[PDB]
Write a protein that binds this ligand. Sequence first.
Ligand code: CL
Ligand code: CL
Ligand code: CL
Ligand code: CL
Ligand code: CL
Ligand code: CL
Ligand code: CL
Ligand code: CL
Ligand code: CL
Ligand code: CL
Ligand code: CL
Ligand code: CL
Ligand code: CL
Ligand code: CL
Ligand code: CL
Ligand code: CL
Ligand code: CL
Ligand code: CL
Ligand code: CL
Ligand code: CL
Ligand code: CL
Ligand code: CL
Ligand code: CL
Ligand code: CL
Ligand code: CL
Ligand code: CL
Ligand code: CL
Ligand code: CL
Ligand code: CL
Ligand code: CL
Ligand code: CL
Ligand code: CL
Ligand code: CL
Ligand code: CL
Ligand code: CL
Ligand code: CL
Ligand code: CL
Ligand code: CL
Ligand code: CL
Ligand code: CL
Ligand code: CL
Ligand code: CL
Ligand code: CL
Ligand code: CL
Ligand code: CL
Ligand code: CL
Ligand code: CL
Ligand code: CL
Ligand code: CL
Ligand code: CL
Ligand code: CL
Ligand code: CL
Ligand code: CL
Ligand code: CL
Ligand code: CL
Ligand code: CL
Ligand code: CL
Ligand code: CL
Ligand code: CL
Ligand code: CL
Ligand code: CL
Ligand code: CL
Ligand code: CL
Ligand code: CL
Ligand code: CL
Ligand code: FE2
Ligand code: FE2
Ligand code: FE2
Ligand code: FE2
Ligand code: FE2
Ligand code: FE2
Ligand code: FE2
Ligand code: FE2
Ligand code: FE2
Ligand code: FE2
Ligand code: FE2
Ligand code: FE2
Ligand code: FE2
Ligand code: FE2
Ligand code: FE2
Ligand code: FE2
Ligand code: FE2
Ligand code: MG
Ligand code: MG
Ligand code: MG
Ligand code: MG
Ligand code: MG
Ligand code: MG
Ligand code: MG
Ligand code: MG
Ligand code: MG
Ligand code: MG
Ligand code: MG
Ligand code: MG
Ligand code: MG
Ligand code: MG
Ligand code: MG
Ligand code: MG
Ligand code: MG
Ligand code: MG
Ligand code: MG
Ligand code: MG
Ligand code: MG
Ligand code: MG
Lengths: 171, 171, 171, 171
Amino acid sequence: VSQVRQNYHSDCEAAVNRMLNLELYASYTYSSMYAFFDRDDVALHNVAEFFKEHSHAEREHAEKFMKYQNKRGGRVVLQDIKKPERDEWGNTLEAMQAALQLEKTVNQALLDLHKLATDKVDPHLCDFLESEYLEAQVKAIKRIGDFITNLKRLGLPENGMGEYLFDKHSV
Amino acid sequence: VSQVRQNYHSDCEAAVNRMLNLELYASYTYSSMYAFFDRDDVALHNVAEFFKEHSHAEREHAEKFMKYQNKRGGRVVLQDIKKPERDEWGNTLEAMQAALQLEKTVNQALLDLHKLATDKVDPHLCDFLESEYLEAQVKAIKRIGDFITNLKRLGLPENGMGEYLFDKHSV
Amino acid sequence: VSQVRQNYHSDCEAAVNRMLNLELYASYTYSSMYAFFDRDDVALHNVAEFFKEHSHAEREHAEKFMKYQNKRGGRVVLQDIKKPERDEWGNTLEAMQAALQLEKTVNQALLDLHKLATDKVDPHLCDFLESEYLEAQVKAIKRIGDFITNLKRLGLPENGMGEYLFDKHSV
Amino acid sequence: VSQVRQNYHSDCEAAVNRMLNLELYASYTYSSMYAFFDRDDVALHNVAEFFKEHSHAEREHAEKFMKYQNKRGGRVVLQDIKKPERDEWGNTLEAMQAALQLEKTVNQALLDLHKLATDKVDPHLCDFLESEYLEAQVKAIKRIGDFITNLKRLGLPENGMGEYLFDKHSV
Ligand SMILES: [Cl-]
Ligand SMILES: [Cl-]
Ligand SMILES: [Cl-]
Ligand SMILES: [Cl-]
Ligand SMILES: [Cl-]
Ligand SMILES: [Cl-]
Ligand SMILES: [Cl-]
Ligand SMILES: [Cl-]
Ligand SMILES: [Cl-]
Ligand SMILES: [Cl-]
Ligand SMILES: [Cl-]
Ligand SMILES: [Cl-]
Ligand SMILES: [Cl-]
Ligand SMILES: [Cl-]
Ligand SMILES: [Cl-]
Ligand SMILES: [Cl-]
Ligand SMILES: [Cl-]
Ligand SMILES: [Cl-]
Ligand SMILES: [Cl-]
Ligand SMILES: [Cl-]
Ligand SMILES: [Cl-]
Ligand SMILES: [Cl-]
Ligand SMILES: [Cl-]
Ligand SMILES: [Cl-]
Ligand SMILES: [Cl-]
Ligand SMILES: [Cl-]
Ligand SMILES: [Cl-]
Ligand SMILES: [Cl-]
Ligand SMILES: [Cl-]
Ligand SMILES: [Cl-]
Ligand SMILES: [Cl-]
Ligand SMILES: [Cl-]
Ligand SMILES: [Cl-]
Ligand SMILES: [Cl-]
Ligand SMILES: [Cl-]
Ligand SMILES: [Cl-]
Ligand SMILES: [Cl-]
Ligand SMILES: [Cl-]
Ligand SMILES: [Cl-]
Ligand SMILES: [Cl-]
Ligand SMILES: [Cl-]
Ligand SMILES: [Cl-]
Ligand SMILES: [Cl-]
Ligand SMILES: [Cl-]
Ligand SMILES: [Cl-]
Ligand SMILES: [Cl-]
Ligand SMILES: [Cl-]
Ligand SMILES: [Cl-]
Ligand SMILES: [Cl-]
Ligand SMILES: [Cl-]
Ligand SMILES: [Cl-]
Ligand SMILES: [Cl-]
Ligand SMILES: [Cl-]
Ligand SMILES: [Cl-]
Ligand SMILES: [Cl-]
Ligand SMILES: [Cl-]
Ligand SMILES: [Cl-]
Ligand SMILES: [Cl-]
Ligand SMILES: [Cl-]
Ligand SMILES: [Cl-]
Ligand SMILES: [Cl-]
Ligand SMILES: [Cl-]
Ligand SMILES: [Cl-]
Ligand SMILES: [Cl-]
Ligand SMILES: [Cl-]
Ligand SMILES: [Fe+2]
Ligand SMILES: [Fe+2]
Ligand SMILES: [Fe+2]
Ligand SMILES: [Fe+2]
Ligand SMILES: [Fe+2]
Ligand SMILES: [Fe+2]
Ligand SMILES: [Fe+2]
Ligand SMILES: [Fe+2]
Ligand SMILES: [Fe+2]
Ligand SMILES: [Fe+2]
Ligand SMILES: [Fe+2]
Ligand SMILES: [Fe+2]
Ligand SMILES: [Fe+2]
Ligand SMILES: [Fe+2]
Ligand SMILES: [Fe+2]
Ligand SMILES: [Fe+2]
Ligand SMILES: [Fe+2]
Ligand SMILES: [Mg+2]
Ligand SMILES: [Mg+2]
Ligand SMILES: [Mg+2]
Ligand SMILES: [Mg+2]
Ligand SMILES: [Mg+2]
Ligand SMILES: [Mg+2]
Ligand SMILES: [Mg+2]
Ligand SMILES: [Mg+2]
Ligand SMILES: [Mg+2]
Ligand SMILES: [Mg+2]
Ligand SMILES: [Mg+2]
Ligand SMILES: [Mg+2]
Ligand SMILES: [Mg+2]
Ligand SMILES: [Mg+2]
Ligand SMILES: [Mg+2]
Ligand SMILES: [Mg+2]
Ligand SMILES: [Mg+2]
Ligand SMILES: [Mg+2]
Ligand SMILES: [Mg+2]
Ligand SMILES: [Mg+2]
Ligand SMILES: [Mg+2]
Ligand SMILES: [Mg+2]
């Protein structure tokens, strides 16, 4: 047993490792979206940069779980970071729809971890999730939803002028 | 009788109370429009902010009537602030049309109060309305009218691209 | 269903709408207290300003619930803002006693909403209440209680000199 | 006829001369109150200074009528400035009560002049009164009324401690 460990259930330790894999997976998916929108035959550079920044944010989310694990006396266990679901992302609307789904998948995992922490009576882990993850997730989901609404209003996927306008005025 | 009261008719005192209720009602209607345009399935944030700011301005208009009432020795009497006419506002054009009508309703009430003040030979109340309310109202009506003209030019309600453009360049 | 909605129970959505009505009601009550203390036959301007500021704070509390509702994918539904319980507030002690009761009523509603959020397993809503509302409420209640103690010490309601002193040194 | 004169009735010209005498009379009354509160056996120096400043303001009101008369092509005609009604002013409450009455007398004269200007269809004179005199008068009356309320609360005339407190915290 780690000398620092106190009130930290094995199940929570394992679930933190799984959560940080998922954050890394989200990072990698956003990296793929960046690369897609930077293609010469896609060429929506503000959209690309949005996804690049979000890739970096997800990596920070993962690193914060690594630090957390060690603070509690758990042990970081890494697994493969699976490649993203798609190799190409269609257009801004399709990518934003995939991003919304990804953020809701990550949110569900965070909520499930909070429920586990609640079941194991771990207020420190509950606070960490509430203070560092859950509100950021709600904000991200709202932002992407707002973007999807605007992309639909702009006539995506068919309206290329609308797609151009979005890249130049929303991001 | 209040020790400060001079040349202040009971009818004017009552009409000032009614006017400040109407200013509060206008504030509340603009708050509703703010909340509508901030919905994830509406997502026109500059439009939302326009209405939020106008909600705050109307509250200031009400507070100025409260202060006025006390300066003249009248007594502020509050009534319920009725909820807005609609729970949802359609789109930017529909909301701006409702805002125009609301501003003209408020203007008519201000003009009616000026006529009452004139009938009761109350130059202080006439000056207050002329100096603090009537020109602001004309300016607000002109601004909203100009917006409606532009929204129609942009093809509202059908043209979603036009609605997007308005939010990004007019507000 | 809103595209952003996740883990947000209908009951919580409705209770958030009710809570923001109550915040608006509290704002309106404080506006009435402001107007009372600004009367020429009351004339306690620092007390009046205390209540005016608190009216503005309550409006901010309401607006934050509107934003919250939209972030979660709920829909803001407004109701009439009822006029305050009284048209005149007696004196500083009576008004502060009414303010204490109002703050405890608002606090109870916040606590009840937290219990609902707990029952529906909504940690985001719990965190929002804990981080943005519950401590502010405890602080406000303590401040008003401290004022009441001092007003009683100063001989309110009978001791007009004590009432004057409070306005000049406590607020 | 003055080369500049246009739409300026003889009756209005005469009433402007009477009004500026009354402003000078008000100035002189406030000078007397200053001197009273500066007596070694009265010795309320902040009260004295309040009245001295108000004496200066009334002189400015008179001078503005002189300038007005000449701008319109009327001719300033001066009369004696009558000495104040009293040689001694009792105490702060008695003096403030006399000041309230004086301000309401001046206000009535301004309102009567506005009615004359209205009857003679002189919008320039109406505007001058509304823009330069009537609101200042309402403000002054409200301020003095608020002071009287506080002096009564403080137990004037009998409560010397209350009178001291007023001088040290209200003025
Ligand atoms: Cl442990
Ligand atoms: Cl424990
Ligand atoms: Cl364990
Ligand atoms: Cl593991
Ligand atoms: Cl894993
Ligand atoms: Cl942290
Ligand atoms: Cl694996
Ligand atoms: Cl693919
Ligand atoms: Cl997903
Ligand atoms: Cl879990
Ligand atoms: Cl939970
Ligand atoms: Cl967070
Ligand atoms: Cl957006
Ligand atoms: Cl289209
Ligand atoms: Cl198209
Ligand atoms: Cl957008
Ligand atoms: Cl009257
Ligand atoms: Cl009159
Ligand atoms: Cl009347
Ligand atoms: Cl009324
Ligand atoms: Cl009303
Ligand atoms: Cl004003
Ligand atoms: Cl009603
Ligand atoms: Cl509706
Ligand atoms: Cl209307
Ligand atoms: Cl009216
Ligand atoms: Cl009129
Ligand atoms: Cl104006
Ligand atoms: Cl325009
Ligand atoms: Cl069109
Ligand atoms: Cl169209
Ligand atoms: Cl425009
Ligand atoms: Cl849900
Ligand atoms: Cl859940
Ligand atoms: Cl539900
Ligand atoms: Cl509801
Ligand atoms: Cl309600
Ligand atoms: Cl917040
Ligand atoms: Cl209701
Ligand atoms: Cl009452
Ligand atoms: Cl209550
Ligand atoms: Cl509840
Ligand atoms: Cl609870
Ligand atoms: Cl708080
Ligand atoms: Cl205290
Ligand atoms: Cl006592
Ligand atoms: Cl007493
Ligand atoms: Cl205190
Ligand atoms: Cl002439
Ligand atoms: Cl003419
Ligand atoms: Cl003539
Ligand atoms: Cl003359
Ligand atoms: Cl004279
Ligand atoms: Cl001038
Ligand atoms: Cl004479
Ligand atoms: Cl005398
Ligand atoms: Cl007099
Ligand atoms: Cl006259
Ligand atoms: Cl008149
Ligand atoms: Cl003025
Ligand atoms: Cl005062
Ligand atoms: Cl006393
Ligand atoms: Cl006494
Ligand atoms: Cl003191
Ligand atoms: Cl005072
Ligand atoms: Fe996983
Ligand atoms: Fe993340
Ligand atoms: Fe694979
Ligand atoms: Fe994310
Ligand atoms: Fe009304
Ligand atoms: Fe208004
Ligand atoms: Fe109704
Ligand atoms: Fe308005
Ligand atoms: Fe309620
Ligand atoms: Fe509140
Ligand atoms: Fe009622
Ligand atoms: Fe409160
Ligand atoms: Fe005279
Ligand atoms: Fe004057
Ligand atoms: Fe005489
Ligand atoms: Fe004066
Ligand atoms: Fe003091
Ligand atoms: Mg060891
Ligand atoms: Mg283990
Ligand atoms: Mg937080
Ligand atoms: Mg946004
Ligand atoms: Mg096309
Ligand atoms: Mg009285
Ligand atoms: Mg009446
Ligand atoms: Mg007329
Ligand atoms: Mg103006
Ligand atoms: Mg313009
Ligand atoms: Mg269309
Ligand atoms: Mg939808
Ligand atoms: Mg529902
Ligand atoms: Mg629990
Ligand atoms: Mg806190
Ligand atoms: Mg304290
Ligand atoms: Mg007493
Ligand atoms: Mg000549
Ligand atoms: Mg003549
Ligand atoms: Mg003015
Ligand atoms: Mg004042
Ligand atoms: Mg005595």
